[PDB]
Amino acid sequence: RKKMGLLVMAMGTPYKEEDIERYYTHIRRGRKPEPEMLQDLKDRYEAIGGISPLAQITEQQAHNLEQHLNEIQDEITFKAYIGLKHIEPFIEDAVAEMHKDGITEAVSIVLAPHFSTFSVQSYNKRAKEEAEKLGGLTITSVESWYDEPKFVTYWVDRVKETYASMPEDERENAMLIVSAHSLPEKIKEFGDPYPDQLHESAKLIAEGAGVSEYAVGWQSEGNTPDPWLGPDVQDLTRDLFEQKGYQAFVYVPVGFVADHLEVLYDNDYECKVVTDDIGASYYRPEMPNAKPEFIDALATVVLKKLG
Ligand SMILES: [Mg+2]
Ligand SMILES: [Mg+2]
Fold this sequence. Notes:
The chain has helices at residues 20-27, 35-47, 52-72, 91-100, 120-134, 149-165, 168-171, 194-209, 233-244, 261-264, 270-278, 292-305; strands at 2-10, 76-84, 105-110, 138-141, 174-181, 214-219, 248-252, 281-283. It is α/β, with parallel strands linked by helices. The radius of gyration is 20 Å and the shape is globular.
């Protein structure tokens, strides 16, 4: 069998509470959070059940993906390497390790289904540049995978189950909100398809699930002076309630693949505060994490990229 590296890339998460400072410093481009922000972040992580389980999900995704790829075809043996943006093991570290280990051919995938210039393209460029610097190692990079039918089906089936679970008055008066991580609006300068891809995800999932009433929102914007993609899910939820009185909101954060702070806090707390305030029911179906159905979707994405 031919040996190939499987470079799995993601933002990263802290491994313990004491990593919060450096992780958020990295996110904030060298700006250390002030003490009240540091305490606030610690509190948020405690509220969602702790930090330890978060980074384990990414590891489990990469490992299960490796094992599943190796089991479903007989031509290639994959070895997974994790490369993260904001904490060790960094993308450049992972590529250098691949080269050290004698890998000469790799395929990469970012654990975010929509292409953007800000994240996916930047991860892919960084990986390819380090390979070029070392020589003798090439990388083929998945750019997007939101339209993989098996992935669409994951979310459609979760959404169906959620609607099926609702009392009758909710089921005929619910709103589905599909979201991803906000990015600066200025990505539009380069024709970034990120927003169009989120809207297509939303269309595909709503259509597959038989949901006629849905909306697209953004969440978890950072803090810079230039505008970020909106509307934010908190504002969208309240606006849609005021205009049409929905009694239940279903949140599908399709941009995210795991139980991390952006979902467990930015949906399950921040959006839940809003639905609680307006008297609506809150639902947010299970994230993919490292579940077999999702791992099969990822495996299919990778093998399609290789033909
Ligand atoms: Mg494509
Ligand atoms: Mg926020």
